[PDB]
Amino acid sequence: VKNSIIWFRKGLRLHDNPALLEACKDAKHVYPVFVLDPHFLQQKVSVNRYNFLLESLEDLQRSFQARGSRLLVLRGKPEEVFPRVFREWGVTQLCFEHDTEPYAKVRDAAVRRLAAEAGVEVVTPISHTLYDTDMLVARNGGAAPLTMQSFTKLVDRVGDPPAPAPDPPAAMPPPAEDMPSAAPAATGVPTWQEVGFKEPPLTVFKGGETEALARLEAAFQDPKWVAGFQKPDTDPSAWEKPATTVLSPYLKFGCLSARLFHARLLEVYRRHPAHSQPPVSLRGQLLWREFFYTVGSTTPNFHRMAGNPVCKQIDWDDNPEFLAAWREARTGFPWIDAIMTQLVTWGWMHHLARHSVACFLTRGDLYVSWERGMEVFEEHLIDQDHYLNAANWMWLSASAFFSQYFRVYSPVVFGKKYDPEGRFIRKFLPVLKDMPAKYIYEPWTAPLEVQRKAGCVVGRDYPAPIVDHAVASKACIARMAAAYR
Ligand SMILES: Cc1cc2nc3c(=O)[nH]c(=O)nc-3n(C[C@H](O)[C@H](O)[C@H](O)COP(=O)(O)OP(=O)(O)OC[C@H]3O[C@@H](n4cnc5c(N)ncnc54)[C@H](O)[C@@H]3O)c2cc1C
Numbered sequence: 001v002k003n004s005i006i007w008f009r010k011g012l013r014l015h016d017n018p019a020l021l022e023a024c025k026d027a028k029h030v031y032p033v034f035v036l037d038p039h040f041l042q043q044k045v046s047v048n049r050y051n052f053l054l055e056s057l058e059d060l061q062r063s064f065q066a067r068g069s070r071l072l073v074l075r076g077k078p079e080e081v082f083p084r085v086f087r088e089w090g091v092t093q094l095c096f097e098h099d100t101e102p103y104a105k106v107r108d109a110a111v112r113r114l115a116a117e118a119g120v121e122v123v124t125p126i127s128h129t130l131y132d133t134d135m136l137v138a139r140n141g142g143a144a145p146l147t148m149q150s151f152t153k154l155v156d157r158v159g160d161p162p163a164p165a166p167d168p169p170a171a172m173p174p175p176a177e178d179m180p181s182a183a184p185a186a187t188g189v190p191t192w193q194e195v196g197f198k199e200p201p202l203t204v205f206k207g208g209e210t211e212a213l214a215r216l217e218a219a220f221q222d223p224k225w226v227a228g229f230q231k232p233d234t235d236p237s238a239w240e241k242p243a244t245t246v247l248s249p250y251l252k253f254g255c256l257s258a259r260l261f262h263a264r265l266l267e268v269y270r271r272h273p274a275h276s277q278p279p280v281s282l283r284g285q286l287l288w289r290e291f292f293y294t295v296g297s298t299t300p301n302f303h304r305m306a307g308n309p310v311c312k313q314i315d316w317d318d319n320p321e322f323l324a325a326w327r328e329a330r331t332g333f334p335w336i337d338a339i340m341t342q343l344v345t346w347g348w349m350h351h352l353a354r355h356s357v358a359c360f361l362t363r364g365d366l367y368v369s370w371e372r373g374m375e376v377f378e379e380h381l382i383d384q385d386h387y388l389n390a391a392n393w394m395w396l397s398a399s400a401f402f403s404q405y406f407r408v409y410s411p412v413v414f415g416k417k418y419d420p421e422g423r424f425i426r427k428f429l430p431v432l433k434d435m436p437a438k439y440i441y442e443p444w445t446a447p448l449e450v451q452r453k454a455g456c457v458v459g460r461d462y463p464a465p466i467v468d469h470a471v472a473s474k475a476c477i478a479r480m481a482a483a484y485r
Pocket residue numbers: 231244245246247248249251252282285286288289290292349350351354355358377381383384385386388389392393396
């Protein structure tokens with residue numbers, strides 16, 4: 001008979017899951033499997049992203065039960081768990097979504113060999129990205145493009161990406177009854193307290209495929225906003241209704257199909273001929289995701305500086321005092337400390353908001369390595385993608401893709417253009433809620449009668465600025481110009 005296993009790592013979804021469909025085809029029994037590392041928290045990972053993953057698994061659980069099945073959350077490592085359940089369940093086929101990530105390439109190489117030892121068929125379709133990221137390198141001559149212009153001219157020569165796969169059947173072959181490794185008490189979705197977190201999550205974005213589809217339909221309620229989308233013209237100060245889609249946490253874990261997003265974008269573009277074009281368009285943002293995935297999967301040490309052939313060797317300073325003040329939201333700049341607060345509370349900030357902290361820490365003011373700030377993002381960001389994190393942090397440090405270090409944001413004037421009243425600051429930094437808008441972005445310039453009337457004395461309730469931006473930026477820019485020579 002055909003007993004199959006659909007292995008979930010990314011792509012935590014039922015729509016456009018081309019492996020679920022193969023695993024359910026002519027199958028007597030289907031085993032939805034997610035391998036969960038029981039330790040990991042004893043080795044880095046906030047309770048915001050892990051609970052977002054757990055909520056995404058609970059959404060798959062309710063979706064599989066509504067179709068007569070059940071999600072199996074197995075404990076242990078894949079190399080130790082799969083050889084057991086292969087012969088316990090009589091597995092003849094193993095399906096899982098393809099992953100071009102470095103740890104994944106090793107992990108999958110190991111499982112495949114084990115699946116070949118047990119006479120199991122391995123089917124790995126491509127559905128996490130838009131196109132075969134390897135066909136994009138092959139058609140280009142054998143090398144990945146290094147500019148967005150050249151990549152967008154490449155995908156247009158390939159054509160439209162594959163359409164989203166059809167929905168799975170309303171009834172699925174359930175797991176076999178009375179299997180020891182499929183016991184409900186052992187294969188259940190754990191909560192954030194049971195895995196070893198003593199702190200509750202504070203994010204406002206819930207995980208799951210159901211929430212990803214609902215937030216998708218909400219963004220497409222106004223097709224005029226979808227068509228004329230220009231990313232660089234958005235608001236980094238909007239928090240009640242973010243100026244963007246906020247679909248990156250769902251696209252990272254796979255709760256939302258990139259093929260479904262692109263297909264819905266083309267439907268709106270066909271009825272709006274004057275829609276925005278890449279890279280500023282909504283489709284262009286998906287192409288940024290596809291551009292960095294193509295380059296990083298073919299580039300050695302992409303997540304690092306040393307050994308990276310595409311990164312610029314920069315003598316970044318080792319200054320734990322500046323790094324700690326930056327990650328603890330105590331730099332003295334309310335605009336910076338608000339975004340670094342939104343980082344640990346929500347796990348998501350606007351793209352231009354992430355531009356201000358990454359520039360302030362690196363080539364702008366503190367001259368600290370982009371790897372140090374990337375490690376701080378890798379823990380709090382609920383949308384933490386390996387290739388997208390690394391390329392964007394090299395972008396902001398003028399170490400790759402970006403070479404314009406004379407462009408430094410002011411930790412005081414950038415946010416004032418969008419939010420002169422400081423609504424964003426008063427929300428995430430309530431210690432400055434009564435400060436007048438004239439000194440909200442520069443509290444150290446406020447009079448002391450003013451400071452006390454508002455309950456924020458600089459040096460007692462809110463720290464002074466750790467650096468002078470005019471002095472710090474002048475010194476960092478000069479060193480960047482020497483390195484680029
Ligand atoms: C220092 C730094 C680190 C970042 N780290 C991450 C990360 O770990 N994960 C992550 O998903 N994005 C990362 N980004 C990119 C960008 O900030 C986010 O994708 C964006 O803020 C998410 O908002 P959204 O989902 O509303 O995007 P939208 O503007 O609505 O775009 C929709 C989708 O396009 C993709 N996208 C958008 N902008 C980019 C971009 N610049 N690069 C690549 N793909 C993009 C995402 O999949 C996103 O969900 C980083 C950017 C910076 C400057």
